[PDB]
Amino acid sequence: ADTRIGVTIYKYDDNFMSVVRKAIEKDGKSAPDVQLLMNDSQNDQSKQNDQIDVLLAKGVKALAINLVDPAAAGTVIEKARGQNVPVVFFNKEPSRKALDSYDKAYYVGTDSKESGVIQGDLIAKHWQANQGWDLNKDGKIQYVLLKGEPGHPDAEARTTYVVKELNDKGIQTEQLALDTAMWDTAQAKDKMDAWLSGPNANKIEVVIANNDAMAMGAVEALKAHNKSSIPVFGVDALPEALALVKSGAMAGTVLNDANNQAKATFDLAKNLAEGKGAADGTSWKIENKIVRVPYVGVDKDNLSEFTQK
Ligand SMILES: [Ca+2]
């Protein structure tokens, strides 16, 4: 009657992982036979490694691990393997070799490349519809880009493929600046503030961000410089960001489906905790032990299908 599942979130105050954490908790409360043991790893992998030892000591039947460091997947797998405990890794993708080293290791995530392509499609759509955004009238987008953590799968794929998609759409681009703000609102506000105080400031046409939290910090810096007409694009469709698309402060974002990634992680973890096949009685398509949940483009034209206009 007491199926214990251990869950580690790499950082509880990452805005998107906060939506994922609350949706997994919602699913756990709704299943009468489950007890979720939730942990905040506080963005430190040593803290997470010790939390996994305490969870195994408490006799959890499955682990749902959102890694701090993707390279620590091996360390986690060996802790789990000794007790025959299945591990459903989520959000930060481990290596293929790491996933292949243990029959009971699974992954729930997304195809990183896809959100980059979708963001580039949105920017392309809106660029063509608002020729007044081309401030210097040269037919090229002069942009700045706010990147997430360097090395991170989603940060590298969204930076590469948003520009790639724009160029493939026949829109030439010129990068005025790019720097990491580590997925953080405050750090993004400061970097955008620096750029608006630098020599490139009058040349900026579009602000591209790897997530909505950083986009929200850029919107604040633009407000302060009375540059609120510069379009900002993000990724995740956070409720607060959807409010800005609704108000026109952001020009578009890409839904990162937190509720279905949460549901897939919970479903796979509970099945595997019960000795059943990972996808039993579900509609999740597992391919090579991986579930990928689609991104969806969001702007003012389909915004009612995600929030109230
Ligand atoms: Ca231009």
Side-chain angles (χ1 to χ4, degrees):
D2 350 73
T3 301
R4 291 171 145 172
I5 296 165
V7 184
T8 59
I9 298 295
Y10 95 97
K11 185 179 169 184
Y12 266 35
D13 55 9
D14 172 289
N15 304 64
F16 179 66
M17 286 316 296
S18 169
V19 187
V20 173
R21 181 287 255 33
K22 293 185 176 66
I24 297 179
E25 291 193 335
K26 185 72 181 183
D27 290 312
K29 278 179 173 171
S30 173
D33 57 318
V34 177
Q35 185 187 11
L36 294 180
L37 300 173
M38 306 294 296
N39 296 267
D40 183 8
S41 299
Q42 303 181 340
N43 201 20
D44 184 350
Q45 191 56 69
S46 291
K47 291 188 183 179
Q48 191 168 93
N49 286 342
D50 294 330
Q51 287 169 328
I52 292 174
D53 291 344
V54 170
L55 290 171
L56 290 175
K58 294 190 179 195
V60 297
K61 296 192 180 301
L63 290 168
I65 306 302
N66 171 223
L67 289 167
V68 175
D69 186 346
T75 297
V76 173
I77 280 176
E78 291 312 309
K79 291 175 181 288
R81 189 203 300 281
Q83 266 179 250
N84 304 287
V85 176
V87 190
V88 186
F89 292 104
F90 64 110
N91 174 251
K92 293 203 198 172
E93 195 165 354
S95 72
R96 183 68 256 177
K97 279 169 282 184
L99 283 174
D100 287 334
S101 67
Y102 185 41
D103 310 278
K104 292 181 187 190
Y106 290 84
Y107 180 68
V108 175
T110 64
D111 176 14
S112 304
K113 173 196 62 255
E114 184 190 54
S115 49
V117 170
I118 294 185
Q119 197 185 40
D121 290 332
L122 280 186
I123 300 176
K125 171 187 177 174
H126 284 283
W127 180 252
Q128 292 305 350
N130 296 270
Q131 288 301 282
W133 285 1
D134 189 7
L135 304 186
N136 75 343
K137 293 156 56 275
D138 67 358
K140 297 168 122 197
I141 302 181
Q142 268 72 36
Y143 69 96
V144 290
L145 198 150
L146 286 158
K147 187 179 185 172
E149 298 177 291
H152 188 304
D154 291 295
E156 300 293 331
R158 290 171 193 168
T159 297
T160 298
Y161 291 92
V162 67
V163 178
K164 221 282 174 182
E165 187 59 20
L166 287 170
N167 299 165
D168 291 354
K169 290 313 197 199
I171 307 176
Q172 300 190 55
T173 53
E174 188 194 325
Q175 181 184 101
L176 297 184
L178 184 150
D179 207 345
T180 184
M182 309 290 243
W183 310 113
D184 187 66
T185 299
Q187 279 188 70
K189 206 300 282 141
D190 278 349
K191 296 265 64 231
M192 192 68 228
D193 183 64
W195 293 336
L196 291 169
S197 301
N200 300 326
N202 61 292
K203 300 148 64 188
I204 301 173
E205 292 172 0
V206 180
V207 181
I208 299 167
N210 284 172
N211 77 341
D212 286 342
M214 287 186 297
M216 293 183 310
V219 170
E220 279 174 54
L222 291 170
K223 239 171 205 177
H225 283 250
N226 301 292
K227 267 287 185 182
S228 57
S229 63
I230 305 303
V232 186
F233 292 88
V235 176
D236 289 339
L238 294 179
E240 298 66 47
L242 293 175
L244 296 178
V245 176
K246 177 175 138 54
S247 71
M250 273 177 72
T253 189
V254 179
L255 176 69
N256 188 1
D257 200 343
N259 267 79
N260 274 334
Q261 284 169 65
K263 181 74 294 201
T265 297
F266 177 80
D267 283 355
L268 267 59
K270 192 188 184 290
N271 270 330
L272 290 166
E274 293 176 349
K276 297 169 185 174
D280 284 4
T282 78
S283 297
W284 301 116
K285 348 193 74 198
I286 308 184
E287 273 152 51
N288 237 290
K289 295 195 296 175
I290 297 172
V291 179
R292 297 196 192 279
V293 178
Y295 285 99
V296 191
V298 187
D299 58 18
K300 266 178 178 164
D301 292 355
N302 65 348
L303 191 73
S304 60
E305 296 153 59
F306 304 102
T307 201
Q308 279 86 54
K309 265 185 174 184

